[PDB]
A paper describes a structure:
Respiratory complex I is pivotal for cellular energy conversion, harnessing energy from NADH:ubiquinone oxidoreduction to drive protons across energy-transducing membranes for ATP synthesis. Complex I transfers two electrons from NADH to ubiquinone, feeding electrons to the electron transport chain for O2 reduction, and captures the free energy released to transfer four protons across an energy-transducing membrane, generating the proton motive force that powers ATP synthesis. All species of complex I contain 14 conserved core subunits (or their equivalent) organised into two seven-subunit domains: a hydrophilic domain that catalyses the redox reaction, and a membrane domain for proton pumping.
During processing, relatively poor map quality was observed for the distal membrane subdomain, and classes that lacked density for it were again identified suggesting the subdomain was lost prior to reconstitution. Different membrane domain conformations could not be separated, but the final map still exhibited lower resolution for the distal subdomain. Two hitherto-unobserved periplasmic β-hairpins (β3-4) are present in the Pd-ND4 and ND5 TMH6-7 loops, and the ND5-TMH14-15 loop contains a substantial flexible periplasmic insertion. The insertion includes 44 disordered residues that are predicted with ‘very low’ confidence by AlphaFold. Additionally, the intrahelical loop in Pd-ND5 TMH12, which protrudes into the membrane and dips towards the periplasmic side, is unusually large (11 vs. 5 residues in other structures). Finally, two Ca2+ are observed on the periplasmic ND2 and ND4 surfaces coordinated by the ND2-Asp260 carboxylate and L477 carbonyl, and the ND4-L197 and P275 carbonyls, but with unresolved densities for some of the coordinating waters. The 13 Å gap between ND5-Lys238 and ND5-His263 in route 4 is obstructed by several hydrophobic residues, including the putative gating residues Trp247 and Leu24854, as observed previously in E. coli complex I15, whereas in other structures, including the mouse and bovine20 enzymes, the histidine is observed in a different orientation, pointing toward Lys238. Following this gap, ND5-His263 is connected to ND5-Lys413 on the ND5-TMH12 loop above the periplasmic ND5 cavity, and Lys413 may connect to the periplasm via ND5-Asp414, His404 and Glu418, across a 5.6-Å unobstructed gap.
Residue numbers in the entry:
A (entry chain L): 1 to 506, 551 to 659
B (entry chain M): 1 to 503
The structure:
């Protein structure tokens, strides 16, 4: 039954991708879509019926060499069960949503066939991520890690006739390989220190790792801190954290349904999953955890500032994903991993709705993506307007200030900000400031596209009409999670320590549980005792951003123009995204090409062959 | 059946002799007969070699199917296989039928083209079965003759220079090894490889000219064998023959050049260098680690700067063999098994990639990357095959490419972390040039007049790739099929190496 969830999407993708000419594109679309809904149904049954006893389901031996053995296997615990419903539910809805969104695509002439290929990629992308989350060993985790990398490369560059898509897909693959550089080095170090890659066997030896010095390069390091850092480098790339983020905003070149799947369920969340799955190690690696907090906090602040000035609708949401993952890494860094997954679970709901809602806006507006030509539209697409409004309420953290009554992101974000206050003063202030920016650019998105006067060309505005039911029903389903997910799961994830202990079935060896928290780790308890001003600070930051956005686009709509003139250098800085792409071209891309040419003509040509030909 | 290795070795050569004698005519019908006879012979050799594979017993680390006969000049004709060489025999016999099938559209001197490949097959097989020191050298250097003519006759515009560089540069390396082999013959009193695997060659330092020879006679013998195998592998900086020979050769010649002939360098290290010169191997380990690390970074960057599609694939091979050399000299269970798996894996992937170059070369008669673009628009099947083997080339998990790279890197990490870090950068650099080549050739829009009428892969071209796709996936998902065969033999080899190290 666990195996069907894992392998049914793979079999459907192979049939749809390779054999649609035999059965037809329409049948191939239903085959993939129907299989995900069956897998999603089984995923929910596994999640709701889980009894807290982790299960191991062998499949096949993968790599066996001397004392090294890694197997194809399924591990089912609380941590996996959470990821099962997230991956299959969002993937299933994207399949259903895609049936209408890709019904007629202008990127392809009538001669070209694309529908069956698109649905085959979605099913395989799902299979890759299901392999990542069910992994019982680090090696199978790497397979799913690289599987989503190649599956994303196929989908970002789906429109292969566009150079921008091909560049973005290539960039995403290469930047993620830089992350897998560190992740591979972590696997090598873990195996030789512990003699295993299996999670349970690793976690048994973690206490001894914290007292072990391992030589790496020019010096000796604490084994736990070094291996924690190396594995996090892999997570930075997959979650598009600072210095490894530039690929995510360029991934918008793919079809909109791909973005909802990449940004909400599969790729970005994998990095957070790895840290939470490896919490037994990080709880014994204090210095690795500190680095995770700084990167998480800085990414949360960085991506929030950049999104303030973006004019493309999908790029505003893309940078919001980078910012939101910054929050999750702060929670994990301070040692509260349930809060990190609580936000991951709620984020999957309302983020997937923001992209699918944005796609509906793009779908209605003749595939225009620039918010400067989206005036009006509140009345022309009512169901898309309310789907996006609920998503904004969730992401901005709308709720009753001092209670536990509010939208999904109200409860999961306030859990992290309280944890940050008890964990890091640096992180706490960067998170509340970033929360203020989150409200501004979220409400800037709503006001620029749904309010004001119809702006831009009038041909698309007059023809704007609501998307078909096949596209709106998935939005409705997600809205159910974007409203009740936070209140439903607040208790099991963050509410009560005893309740959290049994839910995750958590110095003794840190084994047997979905997550581990060290006995000396009390940040979760201190978070509940945070002062009132700390608990309400997210709300005040939210209102401050909302009022600023309202004063900038509804009232006195000339303020955004005047301010940018007053501060032109800073405006260019944010608009150009802090110039990371330009910097990397200067330091990495161009020097690498120059070095290769010099080695080719200087080394092989003039020095080596020059000598051989000389003699 | 009792002479099973001798049959697979000399059946391809015997068939070539019969073909030369009794196959008359030069018209198309004569050429058609030659192609079929070569295909049936190569297929027969593959089927016979499957009997060796399926009756092979991995637990027995000694040599199996051994046959011994008297020979000339006091030497013995001895053949046999163990867990280290059995899979290279099957690789050689597996690629030959596919290579012949790919040459089905050639019309220039077909009978001689079939004869050259049939003769080459027999000589390539003997390298992996010989258990006599001189006999191994005979097959090792005899293969240079047919390949010298394959490049010269059916090669590109610079084939005359490439053929001479390939022969003389390889011949120069091997003659030094010949003198070392004679010395081992004189010291041990035998050319029997099984006997030499247990002989203790002196390892005490002595002064030769103005330098101390750290490792004694073992180091002198090691260097002679290293010079031969380093050039064959090839290692950096003795690799510059390869971008000439592999590029100027015909498509089929390039398949065998990269898929099989390169493996004779890595197999030599596992058969002679470590088993027979363990002290010298331990001393040379630091230098071999850095030569291999440089090769990965150096040739990966050089591949990124190529304007010629076949030169990207050619330079990719040197980078991949860099992993093999590291794994072999890491001299632990994980490194050595990874090295063998990498060598076998590179055979399928590199062979497929050269066949991918051939598919579009046969249509446009140009290897320039800038001459193509948007082939996916007219060539759907080719774009899918070319992407699959592009992914295998960058070591994507699930393909056989990942397993070999992962194991060699982990074995080296145990010894030297600096080398492991530099070598591990290959994952970043391989993706850079491999994906850039695929994009520039296959993706984009079709805007050139010369490509408006290009055709997709024909049924025969597709069927050549299907066996290569299957093997890459099967070993990527179930590598135990290989590590079970090589496992016990590598463990015995690693144990001997450790026992021989100085105390
Ligand atoms: C990356 C560079 C690697 C590096 O810095 O190596 C550190 C080197 C690692 O050597 P080790 O094993 O720790 O000790 C070597 C002793 O010599 C112990 O030496 P030994 O007794 O084992 O015997 C000598 C051993 C010493 O070998 C070594 O490990 C040291 C020298 C290795 C070569 C250095 C890199 C070569 C080029 C790299 C380019 C890659 C792209 O072998 C060699 O001498 C090998 C020589 C290399 C031959 C290759 C040259 C081909 C032509 C070019 O350690 C240091 O020298 C200390 C750390 C210095 C780091 C500086 C790097 C810059 C900042 C980054
Ligand atoms: C390290 C560096 C980190 C710096 C982080 C500080 C962030 C403060 C930003 C200061 C203003 C930047 C600035 O001048 O941008 C300008 C924007 C205005 O919005 P717009 O719709 O893009 O206007 C475009 C206009 N039509 C134009 O072309 O110019 O301005 C804005 O979007 C204003 C948003 C201010 C934030 C409000 C919340 C806090 C209260
Ligand atoms: C062992 C002893 C076996 C007996 C000797 C075999 C001699 C082959 C033979 O019958 O003669 C060559 C044959 C006849 O040619 P002929 O009738 O003169 O002209 C019409 C047909 N070409 O015509 C041929 O078949 C000529 C074919 C020439 C070979 C092809 C060229 C490429 C190189 C082939 C592989 C390398 C062969 C050299 C290996 C030995 C090196 C010392
Ligand atoms: C890439 C690196 C390549 C570097 C060259 C490789 C080394 C080549 C050495 C060949 C083998 C020579 C050898 O083993 O020595 C021969 C002989 C040992 O035999 P011996 O002890 O005389 O036994 C008598 C039998 N009753 O004599 C000895 O004891 C040693 C005599 C050494 C002969 C000179 C070697 C010079 C190396 C070649 C220079 C480069 C060209
Ligand atoms: C192990 C994992 C390996 C992953 C790397 C290989 C993936 C191959 C994907 C093929 C993409 C090639 C580029 C492209 O656009 O392909 C076009 C081709 C034909 O597309 P089609 O829908 O048939 O329509 C005809 C075109 N108008 O499109 C296709 O042929 C699509 C094939 C569907 C495959 C679905 C993904 C499942 C993974 C397949 C792994 C094995 C592939 C072996 C064959 C290649
Ligand atoms: C972990 C802590 C932080 C680490 C700091 C490093 C951060 C990562 C640096 C990433 C640099 C960007 C890589 C991608 C470059 C774009 C490639 C592409 O597809 O563009 C199309 C681009 C041009 O196509 P166009 O944009 O369509 O014109 O293609 C190329 O330029 C071909 C490939 C060039 C070679 C890339 C080599 C990358 C080397 C990175 C080494 C990192 C070492 C640091 C450790
Ligand atoms: C290139 C720049 C390398 C700078 C690394 C400095 C790390 C430091 O000072 O903190 C060590 C710091 C304190 O010492 P410890 O006792 O080893 O923890 O440890 C770490 O946090 C190690 C984390 C791994 C750092 C990457 C090293 C490889 C590059
Ligand atoms: C053209 C190649 C023709 C076949 C090459 C020789 C196959 C050897 C099979 C054994 C022959 C036999 O039974 O005669 C016994 C005879 C003498 O040894 P006996 O087994 O002690 O009678 O063996 C030979 O004639 C050995 C010939 C080896 C030639 C290798 C040269 C090329 C490499
Ligand atoms: C294989 C399928 C059946 C099986 O389990 O085999 C028995 C057997 C496994 O042991 P058994 O099941 O105990 O008989 O397979 C082998 O021993 C060989 C497995 C194939 C290894 C191929 C290595 C790649 C290089 C050689 C060229 C490709 C040859 C393709 C054939
Ligand atoms: C450095 C160590 C030595 C490396 C040697 C690598 C192998 C040689 C690579 C280049 C070969 C050039 C082939 C030219 C082909 C050609 O055009 O021929 C027709 C042609 C003859 O005239 P045609 O037939 O009228 O065109 O060649 C020439 O015109 C050029 C003649 C070049 C002569 C080269 C002979 C010496 C090289 C082989 C021996 C090397 C011994 C090294 C000793 C020191 C060891 C440490
Ligand atoms: C059905 C699969 C047949 C066996 C797969 C291997 C042969 C490749 C497929 C050839 C199909 C065909 O009609 O021949 C075209 C092909 C002719 O070349 P084309 O004109 O490029 O298609 O004929 C052959 O492949 C002849 C050799 C077939 C040997 C099969 C054993
Ligand atoms: Ca020995």
């Amino acid at each position: 039954m666990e195996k069907f969830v894992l392998f049914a999407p793979l079999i459907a993708s192979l049939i749809a991708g390779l054999g649609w000419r035999a059965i037809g594109e329409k049948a191939a679309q239903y085959l993939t879509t129907g299989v995900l809904f069956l897998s999603c149904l089984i995923s929910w049954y596994l999640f709701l019926s889980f009894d807290g006893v982790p299960r191991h389901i062998p499949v096949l031996d993968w790599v066996v060499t001397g004392d090294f053995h890694a197997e194809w296997a399924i591990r089912l615990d609380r941590l996996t069960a959470i990821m099962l419903i997230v991956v299959t539910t969002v993937s299933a809805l994207v399949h259903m949503y895609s049936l209408g969104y890709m019904a007629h695509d202008d990127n392809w002439t009538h001669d070209e066939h694309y529908k069956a290929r698109f649905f085959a990629y979605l099913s395989f992308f799902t299979f890759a991520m299901l392999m990542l989350v069910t992994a019982d060993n680090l090696l199978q985790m790497f397979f799913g890690w690289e599987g989503v990398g190649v599956a994303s490369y196929l989908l970002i560059g789906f429109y292969y006739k566009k150079a921008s898509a091909n560049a973005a897909a290539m960039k995403a693959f290469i930047v993620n390989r830089v992350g897998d550089f560190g992740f591979l080095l972590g696997i090598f170090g873990i195996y030789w220190l512990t003699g295993s890659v299996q999670f349970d066997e690793i976690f048994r030896q973690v206490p001894q790792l914290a007292q072990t010095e391992m030589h790496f390069l020019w010096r000796d390091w604490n084994a736990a801190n070094l291996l924690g850092f190396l594995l996090f480098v892999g997570a930075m790339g997959k979650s598009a954290q600072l210095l490894l983020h530039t690929w995510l905003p360029d991934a918008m070149e793919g079809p909109t349904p791909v973005s909802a799947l990449i940004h909400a369920a599969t790729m970005v969340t994998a990095g957070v999953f790895l840290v939470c799955r490896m919490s037994p190690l990080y709880e014994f690696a204090p210095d690795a955890k500190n680095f995770i907090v700084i990167i998480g906090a800085t990414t949360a602040f960085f991506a929030a500032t950049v999104g303030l000035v973006q004019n493309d609708i999908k790029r505003v949401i893309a940078y919001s994903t980078c910012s939101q993952l910054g929050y999750m890494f702060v929670a994990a860094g301070v040692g509260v991993y349930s809060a990190a997954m609580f936000h991951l679970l709620t984020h999957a709901f309302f983020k997937a709705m923001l992209f699918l809602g944005a796609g509906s806006v793009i779908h209605a507006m003749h595939h225009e993506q620039d918010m400067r030509n989206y005036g009006g539209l509140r009345k022309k697409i009512p169901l898309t307007f309310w789907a996006m409004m609920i998503g904004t309420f969730a992401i901005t953290g709308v709720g009753i200030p001092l209670t536990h009554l509010g939208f999904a992101g109200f409860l999961s974000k306030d859990a992290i900000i309280e944890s940050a206050y008890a964990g890091s003063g640096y992180a706490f202030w960067l998170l509340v400031i970033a929360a203020c920016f989150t409200s501004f650019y979220s409400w800037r998105l709503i006001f620029l596209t749904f309010y004001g006067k119809p702006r831009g060309d009038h041909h698309a505005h007059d023809h704007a009409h609501e998307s078909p039911p096949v596209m709106t029903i998935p939005l409705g389903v997600l809205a159910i999670g974007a409203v009740f997910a936070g209140m439903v799961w607040y208790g099991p994830f963050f509410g009560d320590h005893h309740k959290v202990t049994e839910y995750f079935h958590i110095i003794a060896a840190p084994v047997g549980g979905a997550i581990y928290m060290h006995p000396d780790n009390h940040i979760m308890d201190e978070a509940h005792h945070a002062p009132a001003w700390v608990k309400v600070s997210p709300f005040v930051a939210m209102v401050l951003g909302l009022i600023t956005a309202w004063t900038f686009y509804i009232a006195n709509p000339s303020l955004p123009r005047r301010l940018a003139a007053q501060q032109p250098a800073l405006y260019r800085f944010l608009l150009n995204k802090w110039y990371f792409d330009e910097i990397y071209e200067f330091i990495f891309v161009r020097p690498a090409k120059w070095l290769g040419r010099v080695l080719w003509k200087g080394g092989d040509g003039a020095v080596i062959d020059g000598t051989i030909n000389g003699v | 059946m009792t002479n099973l290795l001798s049959i697979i070795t000399f059946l391809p050569i015997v068939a070539a002799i019969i073909m030369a004698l009794f196959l008359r005519g030069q018209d198309e019908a004569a050429a058609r007969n030659a192609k079929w006879l070569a295909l049936l012979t190569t297929t027969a050799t593959f089927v016979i070699s499957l009997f060796v594979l399926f009756r092979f017993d991995p637990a027995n680390t000694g040599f199996q199917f051994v046959e011994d006969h008297a020979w000339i000049m006091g030497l013995r004709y001895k053949m046999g296989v163990d867990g280290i060489s059995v899979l290279f025999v099957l690789l050689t016999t597996f690629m030959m039928p596919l290579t012949i099938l790919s040459t089905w559209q050639v019309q220039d001197k077909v009978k001689e083209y079939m004869i050259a490949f049939l003769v080459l097959e027999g000589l390539m097989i003997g390298v992996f079965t010989a258990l006599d020191l001189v006999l191994f050298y005979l097959f090792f250097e005899a293969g240079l003759i047919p390949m010298f003519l394959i490049i010269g006759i059916w090669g590109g515009k610079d084939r005359i220079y490439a053929s001479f560089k390939f022969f003389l540069y390889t011949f120069l390396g091997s003659v030094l090894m010949l003198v070392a082999m004679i010395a081992m013959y004189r010291m041990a009193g035998t050319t029997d490889i099984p006997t030499l695997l247990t002989f203790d060659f002196p390892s005490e330092n002595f002064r030769l000219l103005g330098m101390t020879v750290v490792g004694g006679m073992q180091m002198l013998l090691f260097l002679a064998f290293f010079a031969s195998f380093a050039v064959k592998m090839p290692m950096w900086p003795v690799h510059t023959w390869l971008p000439d020979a592999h590029v100027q050769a015909p498509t089929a010649g390039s398949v065998l050049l990269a898929a099989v002939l390169l493996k004779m360098g890595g197999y030599g290290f596992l058969r002679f260098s470590l088993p027979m010169f363990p002290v010298a191997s331990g001393v040379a380990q630091p230098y071999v680690f850095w030569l291999s690390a440089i090769a990965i970074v150096y040739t990966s960057l050089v591949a990124l700067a190529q304007s010629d599609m076949k030169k990207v694939i050619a330079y990719s091979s040197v980078a991949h063999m860099g992993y093999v050399t590291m794994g072999v000299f890491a001299a632990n269970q994980i490194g050595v098994d990874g090295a063998i798996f990498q060598m076998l894996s590179h055979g399928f992937i590199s062979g497929a990639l050269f066949l991918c170059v051939g598919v579009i070369y046969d249509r446009m008669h140009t290897r320039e990357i800038d001459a193509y673009g948007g082939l996916v628009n007219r060539m759907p099947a080719y774009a899918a095959v070319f992407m699959f083997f592009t992914m295998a080339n960058v070591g994507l998990p699930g393909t056989s490419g990942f397993v070999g790279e992962f194991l060699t890197l982990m074995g080296v990490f145990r010894v030297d972390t600096w080398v492991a870090l530099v070598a591990t950068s290959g994952v970043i650099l391989s993706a850079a040039y491999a994906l850039w080549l695929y994009r520039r050739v296959t993706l984009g829009q079709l805007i050139k007049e010369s490509l408006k009428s290009i055709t997709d892969m024909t049924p025969r071209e597709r069927w050549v790739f299907i066996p290569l796709i299957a093997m890459t996936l099967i070993l990527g998902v179930y590598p135990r099929l290989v590590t079970d065969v090589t496992g016990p033999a590598v463990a015995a080899l690693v144990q001997d190496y450790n026992q021989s190290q100085p105390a």
